[PDB]
């Protein structure tokens, strides 16, 4: 019981992807091979997000 | 396309200009055959006669409803005065540089910037903006979407306004449409044509809405002044300086206009 | 230890390699002009889409540049302090200004018995309080007075009346008797160690009248202290939104100190 | 052509009679002496020098000094005027006399102005065609001259190249000559006693140059303004070469 | 000269390598009032300078309690050492003040009347000082209402402190809180819990050490800088800080915060 509260501004994509891209620092070649190598499904892709 | 030059070889009268200037230095002047006077100084400095326009404004606020500068070179005597800073630097921004405008119909649309580059310039007699955030439901922030009062006023009976709002949110607007028009600009670069000289106080133009930026370009400066007449014999006298400072338009195209050519 | 201070760095010049809390200061008048009582609510809204999450904006509000000189605080990692220009306040803005964005070390002043001295460019006496009027006479080798009794105050030469902030700068090597009035004031002996990167100076309205050095010959524009012409607040406060990563990429945290003092006191 | 290879000076300050006033003390001049001794200036090498207003000394200011330092108290009315006394007494001027009553003038080039100063100086001026006929004035009516002056202490006019001029200065209270600016004046440094910092120093409309000699302060009590002044003399100097 | 930075620092372990500091001393009123003696500081500055220290370097600070002393307790000195009298009833009040000028704390502002609040971490506290703090929590579930209590209305709130002139609050980490603190006379602060603060010792001066300092229920420190006496005259207690100044110094050291090389680490 109360007025609707509003839901949060999200966020500017411009500095989403900005942060997105400066994520690609913390990534290891060995092991994103790996991740490659294992096929993503509808299931594994959304399950640990 | 590429365009390929050397760098040790030695490479080795068509154009208007238009002079802008305030009513009041014409009536300081009080003679009626001034702007001919004007015109044969400059035809000693080379400009034949004809190639130089006088275009006269009553105020800044005035001159700022829609500027047409319609020479190839184009200078503005703006008079300074302390309480119209913002209003200055906004026609210092709307005619420095050069803006791609697309219409605004606030009434039924919302509309957000998209970037730093993207704005929302209001021009008419009486421009009173208001506005109200809305989130990723369409419920406005801080304000009721429905009663305008609530809304968030950013400008008053403005001549001019050049508004810039969190980009990424949209907005609903209440712009007073009757005796206003607001358009959505985004700025491309400098609009070499035309340059500004502030006959008056400090320098003050702020034609970058950044914050931590005031650039101050070669086309803008600044003159002290105690009489018309000096402040006009200065321009002539240095015109070649000016026009050095100035550039041919780069602009591709853009709507149809009226210019003063050859 | 020591950080390792005293040891070298050593960087290649090829290789490629590729929650913070912000405070807003403004005066009394932004917050009549806005006339809402959600406006705090609106910006911090605003704030988390240039990615600041809710709770790490505060917004202070000062009365005057005047009360927001006595003995200023710096709460936040970034703090930015927007200044109304006033023409007649240009001494006022100047020592607020040098006061928050350069770091300072200071130590107590006991006037009412010693003599004191400026020692080198970097040495001023600030003063703080609700009414802070300083009278200094200079004394020669002989510990008398030049052009003032040491025994009569009526005669020292003034330097402040009745101010809420003064940074006084003295002829350096030469004492000095103080008749301050500490009843409301309190002066300190203060050296400028640096400049103080936490803190952003946006000025709103006026003509870029900012000198925050003693020295006459400089009047160094660093790149935190930033103007704007204004004429809505609500304008002001989306400016400042829109384009917060551009004055926080300006300024740096590091300097965030223990206390929110804008001085480091030694006794 | 000079190859290389890869104490004994007076410093004269110039004060309006408004920091005196405020100042109030009648040795104040002495203080600022011994001030200046303890900062390495022998006694007897620093002058103080006091003008009314702005306007009173553009009249013909005379700075005999190894070093000269004008403190300028800033108005917003004035800024032409200080920005003309600024201009005379940071550039050397080369000038020679000019009879308005007998000859025609023109300006030869960019370094060529005419500097008037007296009481009084109204100068009103017509430009004339090749065929000696004003253009937009009758020479014969001076009535019709365009004015480029009145009632000025210090008057730096500024015409078109190349075009003869009538002129129609007030002698009676005004002297006009034709002055040629040569270039700086290392002697002279000039320190703005608040303000906004605005001296334009150049006839140029696209340049306002800020050389290292035009200072400005924030200032609230001239005594700060005097000990501000005397605990940097080293840096004024130093900005500024030596002559007399 | 590297500020801002951590170089690892390398030492030898088999070689030999064959004052200008301020001290002071907090006390209460009592001291005073039963001494009874005018030039007692006077007296005590000369023995301080039998022991080594110059006179004019050793400051003695009054306060009246513990509870007015909590307010801020401001100590800008090379070392500082407060003899705090031990009452039955003000254990939580002597903890309380113990950790404060005992450990660094890195403290934010807190308005709670725009935000809610959560402490993410073991070292975050709410520390609250000023002249009469009340402070009310409501925790809130994911839904941002409250949890045993109404987030519209106050009074069901739950009360974690009473007119206290200083509080360290802890809630359960990771939730989200709406405080109702009387802003009006008291302060509140979200703070984290650098370290040891190295300039101040505290000497309890009566009954049983009972000083905790640490919110974790399972550890009681007992650090170095936390010292006990038994007393009946306030002068002896004084001798006896007199007499072993050098040690309580060795027990102490010089702040690490104010030292120049913690320049762009949270000081100088
Ligand atoms: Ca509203
Ligand atoms: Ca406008
Ligand atoms: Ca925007
Ligand atoms: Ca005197
Ligand atoms: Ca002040
Ligand atoms: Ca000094
Ligand atoms: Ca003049
Ligand atoms: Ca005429
Ligand atoms: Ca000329
Ligand atoms: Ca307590
Ligand atoms: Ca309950
Ligand atoms: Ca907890």
């Known amino acids: 019981n109360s007025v609707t509260v509003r839901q949060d501004l999200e966020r500017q994509l411009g500095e989403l992807r900005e942060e997105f891209n400066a994520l690609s620092q913390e990534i290891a070649m060995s092991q994103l091979i790996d991740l490659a190598l294992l096929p993503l499904d509808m299931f594994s892709m959304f399950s640990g997000i | ?262």
């Not at chain 2, 040790?8 to 001919?36: G, R, V």
């Not at chain 2, 209001?122 to 009721?144: D, R, Y």
């Not at chain 2, 600044?222 to 007449?229: D, H, L």
């Open chain 2, 1 to 262: 396309l590429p365009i390929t030059g050397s760098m040790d070889i030695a490479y080795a009268l068509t154009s208007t200009l238009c002079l802008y200037y305030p009513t009041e230095a014409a009536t300081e002047i009080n003679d009626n055959s001034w702007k001919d006077t004007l015109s044969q100084l400059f035809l000693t400095k080379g400009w034949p006669t004809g190639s130089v326009y006088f275009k006269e404004y009553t105020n800044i606020a005035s001159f700022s409803v829609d500027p047409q500068l319609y020479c190839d070179y184009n200078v503005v005597l703006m008079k300074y005065d302390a309480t119209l800073q913002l209003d200055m630097s906004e026609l210092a921004d709307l005619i420095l540089n050069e803006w791609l405008c697309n219409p605004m119909d606030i009434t039924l649309y919302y509309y957000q910037q998209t970037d730093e580059a993207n704005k929302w310039i209001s021009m008419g007699s009486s421009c009173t903006i208001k506005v109200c955030p809305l989130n990723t439901q369409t419920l406005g922030i801080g304000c009721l979407t429905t009663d305008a009062t609530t809304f968030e006023e950013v400008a008053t009976a403005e001549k001019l306004v050049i508004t810039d709002v969190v980009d990424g949110v949209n907005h609903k607007l209440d712009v007073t449409t009757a005796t206003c028009t607001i358009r959505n600009c985004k700025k491309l670069g400098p609009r070499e044509n035309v340059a500004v000289i502030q006959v008056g106080g400090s320098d003050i133009l702020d034609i970058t809405a950044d914050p931590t930026t005031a650039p101050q370009t070669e086309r803008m400066m600044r003159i002290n002044w105690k009489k018309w007449w000096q402040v006009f014999y200065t321009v002539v006298d240095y015109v070649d300086q000016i026009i050095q400072v100035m550039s041919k338009r780069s602009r591709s195209l853009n709507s149809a206009a009226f210019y003063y050519r050859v």
